[PDB]
Amino acid sequence: YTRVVWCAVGPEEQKKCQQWSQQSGQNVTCATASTTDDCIVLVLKGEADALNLDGGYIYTAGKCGLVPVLAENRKSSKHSSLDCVLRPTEGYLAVAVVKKANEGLTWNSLKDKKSCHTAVDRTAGWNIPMGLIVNQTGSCAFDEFFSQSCAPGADPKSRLCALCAGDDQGLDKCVPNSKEKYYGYTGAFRCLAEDVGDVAFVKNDTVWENTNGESTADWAKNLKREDFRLLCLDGTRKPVTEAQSCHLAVAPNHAVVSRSDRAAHVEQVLLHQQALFGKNGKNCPDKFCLFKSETKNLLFNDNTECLAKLGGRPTYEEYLGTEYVTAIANLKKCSLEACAF
């Protein structure tokens, strides 16, 4: 069984994946697609074995029968004696960030503002905030809530893509992959940091990893945590140090999914690959680091300490949790059960 074919979303993840391939002795090989959904399709077809996914894509993947294999585990202090690989996942905090200088902007004053989403169908950048909004406004017209937005994956012509910038040559505007300047956690935050949008829907970690010198990237260099605030659901504004108490929801960690019949082997190969390229990987610093990508979260989030065993051999609905799964169906009622491909 020993060859695992990873699916890369976009050319940058492709470049990284090939490096990982070369270094793995072709134990890991690559397949590329322009979107996560397409990568879900190559795995369904058996042309790729796996990829790591945000919760919202796990939902889509799971309805098609794909199963969670290993979950991303970030740097947590609590539960410190257990190996990261066997450490329960704690989840991440989906937050709404704004510029402090943008005084008076609260959760209750978001209507008609400019927003930045990681990508349509993602947990923190879309399902959480939009499900909240739809719920709160009683309307399915979330395409009309923000005056303008950058929501990779939405219709390029629509105002949900208006603030997206595309790539270096302005091409691929709004594609849900790293080619789009404002794609993902980093891109949605850069979208806010450059005042292209008024609010960014990312996770707690995003704000920290890109402020106070934590990045070096041109646009982030000069960012200071105090210039940002989190919008709490109670209409309040708190510093980005108050995430445990000012968030939209806690999200299930991004996780690797593969076809049910390939899971066991994808799991085995993966644990052996992070032992080599993970946070303490034998060859990480020197040769290759699976969880680093110049701050671009390619294939995995950069703050991933390791990929952990799941426990309860959970279904995708159990891994996402009932609370989260209800939100996504209730939100998708605006677009009853079956694989979207």
Ligand X SMILES: *[C@@H]1O[C@H](CO)[C@@H](O[C@@H]2O[C@H](CO)[C@@H](O)[C@H](O)[C@H]2NC(C)=O)[C@H](O)[C@H]1NC(C)=O
Ligand Y SMILES: *[C@@H]1O[C@H](CO)[C@@H](O[C@@H]2O[C@H](CO)[C@@H](O[C@@H]3O[C@H](CO)[C@@H](O[C@@H]4O[C@H](CO)[C@@H](O)[C@H](O)[C@@H]4O)[C@H](O)[C@@H]3O)[C@H](O)[C@H]2NC(C)=O)[C@H](O)[C@H]1NC(C)=O
Ligand Z SMILES: O[C@@H]1[C@H](O)[C@H](O)CO[C@H]1O
Ligand U SMILES: *[C@@H]1O[C@H](CO)[C@@H](O[C@H]2O[C@H](CO)[C@@H](O[C@@H]3O[C@H](CO)[C@@H](O)[C@H](O)[C@@H]3O)[C@H](O)[C@H]2NC(C)=O)[C@H](O)[C@H]1NC(C)=O
Instruction: List binding-site positions for Fe(3+).
Output: 54, 92, 185, 254
26 to 65: interface string for ligand Z, x by CB under 6 A: -----------x----------------------x-----
* Residue number with CB closer to Fe ion (252 or 281): 252
Selection from ligand Z, Fe ion, ligand U, none that 335 binds (CB < 5 to 8 A by kind) is: ligand Z
* Residue number with CB closer to Fe ion (54 or 180): 54
Give CA 122 to chain center in angstroms. Answer: 6
Taking CB under 5 A as the criterion, the residue among 275, 318, 321, 332 binding Zn ion is 318
| Residues numbered 240-279 forming contacts with ligand Z, rule: CB under 6 A | 250, 252-253
Q: How far is CA 231 from CA 64, 104, 243, 313, in A?
A: 35, 11, 10, 36
Q: 72-88 in b/e burial notation, b at 16+ Cβ within 10 A? A: bbbeeeeeeeeebbebe
The label of the residue with tokens 């008024």 reads 198
Integer Cα distance of 297 and 256 in angstroms: 14
Q: Per the structure block, which two tokens stand in for 201? A: 């829907």
Least Å from the CB of residue 156 to Zn ion? 34
Taking CB under 6 A as the criterion, the residue among 89, 115, 204, 210 binding ligand Z is 89
- Nearest CA-CA partner of 119 in 27, 186, 52: 186
Taking CB under 6 A as the criterion, the residue among 27, 35, 106, 236 binding ligand X is 27
The label of the residue with tokens 């426990």 reads 311
Q: Per the structure block, which two tokens stand in for 159? A: 């105002």
**62 contacts ligand Y (rule: CB under 6 A):** no
- Nearest CA-CA partner of 200 in 186, 212, 210, 220: 186
Binding footprint of ligand Z on the chain (CB under 6 A): 37, 60, 89, 91, 120-121, 250, 252-253, 319, 321, 324, 335, 340
